[PDB]
Design a binder for this molecule. Structure first.
Ligand SMILES: NCc1ccc2c(c1)C1(CCN(C(=O)c3ccc(C#Cc4ccccc4)o3)CC1)CO2
Ligand SMILES: NCc1ccc2c(c1)C1(CCN(C(=O)c3ccc(C#Cc4ccccc4)o3)CC1)CO2
Ligand SMILES: NCc1ccc2c(c1)C1(CCN(C(=O)c3ccc(C#Cc4ccccc4)o3)CC1)CO2
Ligand SMILES: NCc1ccc2c(c1)C1(CCN(C(=O)c3ccc(C#Cc4ccccc4)o3)CC1)CO2
Lengths: 242, 242, 242, 242
């Protein structure tokens, strides 16, 4: 997370951390609890190569990374079959926890958007995670969860930003319909936030609009953060999650 | 280059090395002289972001990198308009030298293939360059140009291989029609070889079948090297090059 | 710390962590509380070059580095004037805290040895710290304080051990009388443990025998850990600490 | 070498490169040819730990490292017995080549100084090598041999300077009688120059005044390069070298 600050303990109870086995269970991506037994994340976090589930754990909302881990095992990893790169799209996956979580006040699900929802350019959206605080700058110990408000930028506008200072034909679409742009030169997600939630408040309800997916660097000029657009994948999600 | 060996001084007169301005003029990509004033390379070597022409130089065939440099300024960089990631394709670019080179017998052009050439398996093909000699393993000083003979694999055969050990649906095509596959677990191209020539001997003449483009690591199981297919882009090449 | 295990929360209440200002207040050396207002540590942690007082802080006994820091400013760094390299000796220094520590049962001073105590082999001694868990191997988050029981040996055997497999003349003293040696191929202090305490239980009282100083690698054959022999410097210490 | 300039191809015919076996025969220290069968270098380059002869090669003077290698095996490594740390001193060693070298125009021995020569300030002196060109900055390909003219500083003056901005007591001698000091903030040897020659033009002959030994960083204020004083060890050298 670039800009923004430490998240208050009461906020973002759906934020999760994905751990990879090694000399310790190291954070490598974010995710959200969308159901007591399912976590939504980015496909590029766990794919396209198939890995061993024994080497993966999930950690539920935690104020500081590593401090009081209660790692949860995963029984299934479901990666969108269209996925193989973030730029091509379909950057979305589901992890089934071995057991339902006993859901509470500091840990509970985020609500997915209705099939209609648009999230117009200039709305209140927040992205959260334990990722880098700038290009090539790790979040320092004790690794607090970070939050930052980012402005939505509608797709065509965002796609045109991405053509500025690049060779790509203006007719070539870079920002796809299954994606969504947010952020600017001061507020953005970064490496290690991948797979985590972009949420927006609408009618007093937090809806997860996006999954942190990709972009060119973090908070670079004319390169807003790119998210997988959740509404686009609702039908696929509900094929697995109650 | 993975596997293979140091090239003889006579061979591959069209091989060039791309240099970026820094603490020294460092090699970053390969290329081939296809016309006394034009170099064929990979788009991902120079794009998709537009960079400064003054930060770039071309070195013509040289047995050891850096030893007897004679760097050539470039007057313009032409990247295929469809390009923005190597996986999406159109990974091909052209460099116009400020001046034609005084063609030699140590330096001269490679022949482009006729549009009809398919380069089927069994064809004798070589890739060359000064890239890494294995994953994360640098070519050591004095940086001899290396060469390696790689077996060609049909696109659809290569496509299936990239689905082994991957989540990606069988209906999702990874190896595209503008691509070509070559190499195995002992012979392949690598980081630093990008942009360089895959050439095959056809009825006595060496034709450039491909441009080193991408792949999953180097010489990994079920992950043949992927090249931009030169035939596919002949019309685009011919629009610029005499 | 190499070998051994996480310290129980009630143990080693005199252990401290020295922090250097940066992107965060990063642990760089250990120390020990020897008086409510004085920390004992290694000279090579703070010298031979004089650094800015304002770039240093002291952290008292924590289970886990960084998580609930209460950083303390220092008013004086006093380095033994004989010191310039650990290999030569006098590797000892004192930090005066701006204000006295209000001691409890989780934070309090360690007792210094009488001048007469030689800490012969067979004595039960532990070294504690947040240092590397092996050669070139960082302590993993969440950075628990570690402890290891290490065998004390005599100076003459430690000196001779260091000549083993080395060119140095047998008549050249490497391990000097102001040093003390402990550890083996399985139990040792390491980088990041420097300046921290080696303590032994004598007559049911814990006495600080040494200050982590140097050695060749950690837990290497014939290279035991070398500590500054605290008894050697009692007079100097007592010029400053009441 | 911090800085100076590339050496002219006719200069310093006695300079040698020491190479350690690995992925390639990598330069790690310099040395000088003082006899057709003996190389003079620094002790810390080959000790104090005894290493295997098979892992070492000597390369005679090359204009550019690695390009025309003709590696020479060593049959004896002789390390001064007083040595264990560069800062304590006796940082001098001898390599006996397996076979004598056939002296050329481009390769010949450097003359040792008469015991009487003190090398006062104001003498024309050069240090040479393929070491770093600044703190943590490698010599770039093609690795030209560098030379820099360095100002000699008297021992007592240099010793005093090493106390500037340090805690070390004034009556503690840092720069010893078997050392010599040279360089300033624009001119110094550096990592990788270790073991190489400091030479001075005296009465029409180049004499080797010093062997590159140590210093606090390279070209830092009040921290001139420290060399092993050759005259101090003439007896020891002549015990081995005809
Ligand atoms: N901040 C969100 C954001 C969030 C998480 C995250 C990134 C960006 C990464 C994504 C990949 N990455 C890259 O930098 C990258 C990979 C591919 C491209 C591109 C492009 C491009 C295409 C057309 C025109 C211009 C540029 O940029 C580093 C930043 C690392 O993980
Ligand atoms: N050796 C040719 C080859 C030649 C040059 C070169 C590479 C490979 C790179 C390409 C990018 N890279 C990768 O590692 C990479 C980037 C994207 C993927 C992938 C994939 C995949 C897609 C679908 C199914 C399975 C895997 O792998 C390192 C090796 C670096 O430069
Ligand atoms: N484990 C305690 C221990 C505790 C902390 C610590 C070390 C060792 C270091 C000390 C320096 N270092 C070295 O490795 C080193 C520096 C100097 C020498 C030497 C020597 C020698 C002298 C005579 C004969 C043979 C060798 O070895 C890495 C391990 C790093 O910090
Ligand atoms: N440029 C010659 C020079 C030539 C070669 C070379 C160095 C210096 C090194 C020596 C070691 N090193 C250090 O930096 C170092 C090791 C020990 C000390 C010290 C000290 C000191 C003692 C008393 C008072 C003040 C400082 O500094 C980096 C530069 C590495 O290789």
């Amino acid at each position: 997370i670039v800009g923004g600050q430490e998240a208050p303990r009461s906020k973002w109870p759906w934020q999760v951390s994905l751990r990879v086995h090694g000399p310790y269970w190291m954070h490598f991506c974010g995710g959200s609890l969308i159901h007591p037994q399912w976590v939504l994340t980015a496909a590029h976090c766990v794919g396209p190569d198939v890995k061993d589930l024994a080497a993966l754990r999930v950690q539920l909302r935690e104020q500081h990374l590593y401090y009081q881990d209660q790692l949860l095992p995963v029984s299934r990893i479901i990666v969108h079959p269209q996925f193989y790169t973030a730029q091509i799209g379909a950057d979305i996956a589901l992890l089934e926890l071995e057991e339902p979580v006993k859901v509470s006040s500091h840990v509970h699900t985020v609500t997915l958007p209705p099939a209609s929802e648009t999230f117009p350019p200039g709305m209140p959206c927040w992205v959260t995670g334990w990722g880098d605080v700038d290009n090539d700058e790790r979040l320092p110990p004790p690794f607090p969860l970070k939050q930052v408000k980012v402005p939505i930028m509608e797709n065509h506008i965002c796609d045109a930003k991405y053509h500025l200072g690049a060779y790509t034909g203006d007719d070539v679409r870079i920002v796809r319909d299954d994606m969504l742009c947010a952020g600017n030169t001061r507020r953005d997600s970064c490496q290690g936030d991948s797979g985590g939630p972009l949420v927006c408040k609408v009618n007093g309800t937090w809806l997860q609009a996006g999954v942190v997916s990709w972009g060119e660097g973090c908070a670079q000029p004319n390169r807003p953060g790119i998210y997988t657009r959740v509404t686009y994948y609702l039908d696929w999600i509900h094929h697995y999650v109650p």
